[PDB]
UniProtKB/Swiss-Prot annotation, chain A:
Effect caused by changing residue 10 to K: 70-fold decrease in GTPase activity. 2-fold decrease of affinity for GTP
Protein name, entry field: tRNA modification GTPase MnmE
Described function: Exhibits a very high intrinsic GTPase hydrolysis rate. Involved in the addition of a carboxymethylaminomethyl (cmnm) group at the wobble position (U34) of certain tRNAs, forming tRNA-cmnm(5)s(2)U34.
Ranges for domain TrmE-type G: 1-160
Effect listed in the UniProt record for changing residue 33 to A: 22-fold decrease in GTPase activity and 7-fold increase of affinity
Residues where Mg(2+) binds: 14, 35
Chief subcellular location: cytoplasm
Quaternary organization: Homodimer. Heterotetramer of two MnmE and two MnmG subunits.
Stated family: Belongs to the TRAFAC class TrmE-Era-EngA-EngB-Septin-like GTPase superfamily. TrmE GTPase family.
Gene Ontology BP annotations: chaperone-mediated protein folding; regulation of cytoplasmic translational fidelity; response to pH; tRNA methylation; tRNA wobble base 5-methoxycarbonylmethyl-2-thiouridinylation; tRNA wobble uridine modification
Keyword list, A-Z: Cytoplasm, GTP-binding, Hydrolase, Magnesium, Metal-binding, Nucleotide-binding, Potassium, tRNA processing
Species per Swiss-Prot/TrEMBL record: Escherichia coli (strain K12)
Protein localization: Cytoplasm
Residues of the full protein shown: 217 to 376 of 454
Taxonomic classification: Bacteria, Pseudomonadati, Pseudomonadota, Gammaproteobacteria, Enterobacterales
GO MF term (any one): GTP binding
Gene: mnmE
Amino acid sequence: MKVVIAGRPNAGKSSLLNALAGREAAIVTDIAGTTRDVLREHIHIDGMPLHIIDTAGLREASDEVERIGIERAWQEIEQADRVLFMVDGTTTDAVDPAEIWPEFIARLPAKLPITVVRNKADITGETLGMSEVNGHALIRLSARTGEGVDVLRNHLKQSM
Amino acid sequence: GMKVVIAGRPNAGKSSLLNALAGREAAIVTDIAGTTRDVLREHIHIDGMPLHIIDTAGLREASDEVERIGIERAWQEIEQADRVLFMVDGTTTDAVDPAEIWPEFIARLPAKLPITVVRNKADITGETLGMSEVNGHALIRLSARTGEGVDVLRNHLKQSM
Ligand SMILES: Nc1nc2c(ncn2[C@@H]2O[C@H](COP(=O)(O)OP(=O)(O)O)[C@@H](O)[C@H]2O)c(=O)[nH]1
Ligand SMILES: Nc1nc2c(ncn2[C@@H]2O[C@H](COP(=O)(O)OP(=O)(O)O)[C@@H](O)[C@H]2O)c(=O)[nH]1
Ligand code: ALF
Ligand code: ALF
Ligand SMILES: [Mg+2]
Ligand SMILES: [Mg+2]
Ligand SMILES: [Rb+]
Ligand SMILES: [Rb+]
């Protein structure tokens, strides 16, 4: 199954791709617009194989390559079986994704299931782990420190 | 199966080749040098023979930090290749010997690593497509943009590996 990592620039999408991959598969920097190309990694949880797909942070970009990467990111979303909507927790205390970015949520294919991932729990102090908002799955992790990425691994097995 | 790494200077047509081999638009291609930075890996098959194709950032002295980093990762894939396709923009030089095109690059490769010199953009130079040899290296003239000469590459990849 195709699981697409998507959200704003600098949310930590590539860190999570790397954590899920177990491998420095995507470049990771604090410069917004680091990922432009779509990056795919084939993994296996527990007998369940999936493609995890890292994408350019969504925005209106004047960098042409990034502009193209954002086109393709939306195209990956269109074909996704699940989106992991990645949020930098330090930027908002909001947990309902309609409060975080309604425009993005509203644009997503109807009934494409969304897992909301409040990342950088290491700066927030947020309590780690899974819950649910407005019927959307909600995982609090650190992609950088691996802290709580395990629950997400199990979540994917369960839900897919 | 084995790992084929596409390497060379920026804008040589390495992503264009990856997409022609993969039969789909895996890598972003533009006229802008420094488009590719992350390493892109595609798994393909030729005549049933499985093959890994790795696209890399063009090697240059880059001002952009993400690109500098992709260049490092590009080298770290090269070190680990079973073959390198050394892609050269044909309209930039009439040279065929990789030693005349970029000696530094050629010398830094691991001792055992074979290389196929690919002279890309043959649609512009008008050079005859197909296979030859320079100084013991395999040599191929093709257009990744049009796909002309790429079957010769595919056949060379199956025979060579
Ligand atoms: N402190 C902390 N930083 C993170 C975490 N995840 C990502 N980052 C950092 O935030 C910046 C952007 O990360 P990256 O994965 O490349 O973001 P992307 O643009 O969404 O893919 C980098 O400096 C990362 O090291 C996290 O869980 N905790
Ligand atoms: N005329 C011609 N143009 C090409 C060919 N291959 C690539 N290009 C163009 O050269 C530019 C750089 O190509 P790209 O594949 O992104 O280069 P890379 O930086 O080495 O990956 C783009 O404008 C391509 O369309 C070719 O065989 N013929
Ligand atoms: F801002 Al990014 F990958 F570098 F979304
Ligand atoms: F210049 Al490139 F991939 F964009 F080597
Ligand atoms: Mg990224
Ligand atoms: Mg390229
Ligand atoms: Rb980034
Ligand atoms: Rb390019």
